[PDB]
Design a binder for these strands. Structure first.
Lengths: 184, 212, 45, 134
RNA sequence: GAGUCGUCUCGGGCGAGAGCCCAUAUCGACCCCGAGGCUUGCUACCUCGCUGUCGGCUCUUCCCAUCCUGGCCCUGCAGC
RNA sequence: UAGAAGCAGCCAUCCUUUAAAGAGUGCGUAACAGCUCACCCGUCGAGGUCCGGGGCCCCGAAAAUGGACGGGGCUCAAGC
């Protein structure tokens, strides 16, 4: 099990992303927008030491080392968030009634969900943009977290739990996440 | 295990054969290679591995300079799934044998292809299906002949140093033709204090002596 | 239709110490340890 | 196939099985069971056992490429022992034993089918097939 | 009524076993450990210069280990 | 047994050869085919995965006027 005792990690940043700290809060600014996050752990200093952002605490514990690596991964997703967007594709597939998925406002509305005269809805955050092209639907946007939430909110609304789950199966599902979610 | 148990056992192995070569045995499965593997065994040689025994050349150099030394094999050559091939076959026989058995290649889409990828003309021997639709999309003529899907004419789809894409690879696969044309590469061949490489094995010295 | 739906919905595990659909890599709810637990769906599976 | 058109079984002591050969039909040479006729004689041994082989049914220039089941090692040892079964009830009877000369005759012809590199190595394969039957 | 908790009520752990096959869709023995004060009983602490019984009626408070309504999960959940 | 061709089931579970192979882990097929694992070498270029005692803290934990640590309030302590 991990041989740390400093504990100190180092996070590699290019010259194409600059990062500036002011307290225990990290802001990452690159070509395409910027994104700020708050990393909230107590007793840990996050600071920029030259070209590298370093996350450290003097007293190592098993719990602190997990938190340090999670924060380090968050900066990396932010880095590849501020260079280029993340794309998840979802497909709408249906059991009987053609099903019309359009974005009206800052919510996606789905109508003709099993012949329904009522909406199913899922929230679409401003950092994420949702475009519908036929019955492929693409959730796209700056940050991996924003993109992950927006896409998943769409699947859960349409989610079948009200009847049989092997025979009633109409709804829009996560065809791409970055593999094929999710099985046992 | 322990170091220099293995290197020693290999040290001994190397002296026994006149010709010791390093080849990349990572390119090929497994029925093709295995029928060749068997064939080598009958014709006086064997193939071997273990994790770190294609390095520690210093003991091998000390053991002799006619096997695998550091003399010309300066760099300690350990490639991803390389093996060491010991044989009686002279480097020129060894080289030629190797160029002929090499095929079929695996499918690994997204590689840069070391050799040309072609589509031929003729029947696939597969029935009407989405396979006619794919061929048309690439702009490869087709027709139904034999009640089967047929190509009306070939064309060379990609060159060396060009990637096979997954869409392209998938078409090569549906056809049941490999997208890749890699097989066993010889990194280098050693015999009796001289290193043979494909450029060495290719020319012959006496042809220059004879003209001049 | 079919293999999209049954994945997001159905490709998970259940723990018969909690009576709730938990992650598949989990052997617990979030805590309840192990007894000797097994699927979820039986007869057709 | 899933009623056995490509996949076909031919007997090593009898000829024209009804189940693969009747549904698949069509002239492949002149019949499905043209190839069949060729196979049964060559593979034939004491035991009439089911020898997997393949045909490819294409009606349309009467095209086929076929494999030739060269008789298996299992089938060959039946002939030498004199039993067309291993045991009449799985693993409660005699699997038999071969004298030294008979195992070598089998290996000799088998060599080419086997992965081997000497003729001793082959004979160890055949003797081992003998011991575990049932 | 207090004390008490054998009796009673209820829970948890282990899982023999049947459910075509598959312990847990469902049902669940042997055994072991708690909780409650709602049955029964034990206690003789409190009252014999009286603290009047039960049931109904009427009128009201509180509690959940929840019958229904709301929101949820599984299934040996096709639908119903 | 039509098929049991690793994969209805029963028992055996042997031998040669190695990036690599279990008379085969699961899927799949009427049974095959096909998809795939353990496994291995190698890249990432490290200290790696374990198991076993102890202390503590969590889960296990459902009750009837508002009752609880004496009360307030207290989480680098006013806690152990």
């Amino acid at each position: 099990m991990p041989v740390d005792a400093w504990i100190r990690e180092e996070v590699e940043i290019p010259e194409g992303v600059e990062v500036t700290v002011e307290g225990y809060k990290v802001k990452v600014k690159g070509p395409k927008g910027e994104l700020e996050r708050e990393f909230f752990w107590p007793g840990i200093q996050i600071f920029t030491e030259d070209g590298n952002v370093v996350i450290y605490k003097d007293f190592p514990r098993r719990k602190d080392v997990a938190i340090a690596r999670t924060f380090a991964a968050h900066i990396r997703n932010m880095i590849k968030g501020v260079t280029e967007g993340f794309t998840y594709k979802l497909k709408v597939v249906y059991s009987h009634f053609p099903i019309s998925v359009k974005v009206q406002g800052d919510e996606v509305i789905i109508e003709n969900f099993l012949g329904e005269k009522a909406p199913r809805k899922a929230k679409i955050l401003p950092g994420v943009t949702v475009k519908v092209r036929g019955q492929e639907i693409i959730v796209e946007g700056i940050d991996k977290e924003a993109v992950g939430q927006t896409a998943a909110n769409i699947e859960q609304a349409t989610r079948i739990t009200k009847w049989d789950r092997r025979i009633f199966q109409d709804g829009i599902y996560i065809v791409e996440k970055a593999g094929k979610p999710i099985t046992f | 295990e322990w170091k220099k148990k293995e290197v020693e056992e290999l040290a001994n192995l190397i002296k026994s054969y006149p010709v010791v070569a390093l080849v990349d045995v990572s390119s090929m499965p497994a029925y093709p290679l295995s029928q060749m593997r068997r064939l080598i065994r009958e014709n006086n040689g064997l193939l071997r591995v273990s994790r770190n025994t294609l390095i520690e050349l210093a003991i091998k150099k000390v053991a002799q300079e006619l096997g695998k030394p550091e003399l010309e094999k300066l760099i300690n050559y350990i490639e991803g799934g390389a093996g060491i091939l010991v044989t009686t076959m002279n480097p020129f026989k060894l080289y030629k044998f190797l160029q002929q058995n090499r095929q079929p290649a695996p499918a690994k889409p997204g590689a840069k292809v070391p050799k040309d990828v072609v589509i031929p003309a003729g029947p696939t021997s597969l029935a009407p299906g989405p396979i006619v639709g794919q061929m048309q999309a690439m702009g490869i003529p087709a027709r139904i002949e034999r009640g089967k899907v047929t190509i009306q004419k070939d064309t060379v789809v990609l060159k060396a140093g060009e990637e096979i894409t997954p869409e392209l690879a998938n078409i090569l696969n549906a056809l049941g033709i490999q997208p890749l044309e890699v097989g066993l590469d010889l990194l280098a061949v050693y015999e009796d204090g001289i290193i043979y490489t494909p450029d060495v094995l290719a020319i012959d010295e006496s042809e220059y002596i004879n003209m001049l | 239709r079919f293999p999209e739906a049954e994945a997001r919905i159905f490709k998970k595990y259940v723990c018969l110490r909690c009576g709730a659909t938990n992650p598949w890599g989990a052997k617990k709810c979030r805590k309840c340890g192990y007894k000797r637990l097994r699927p979820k769906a039986k007869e057709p599976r | 196939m899933p009623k056995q058109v490509v996949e076909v079984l031919v007997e090593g002591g009898k000829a024209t099985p009804g189940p693969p050969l009747g549904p698949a039909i069509g002239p492949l040479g002149l019949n499905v069971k043209q190839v069949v006729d060729k196979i049964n004689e060559a593979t034939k041994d004491f035991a009439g056992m089911q020898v997997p082989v393949k045909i490819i049914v294409d009606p349309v220039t009467k095209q086929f490429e076929i494999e030739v089941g060269v008789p298996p090692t299992s089938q060959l040892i039946k002939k030498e022992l004199g039993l067309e079964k291993g045991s009449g009830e799985p693993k409660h009877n005699i699997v038999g034993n071969l004298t030294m000369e008979q195992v070598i005759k089998i290996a000799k012809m088998k060599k080419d089918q086997m992965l081997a590199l000497t003729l001793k190595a082959a004979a160890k394969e055949v003797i081992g097939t003998a011991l575990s039957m049932g």
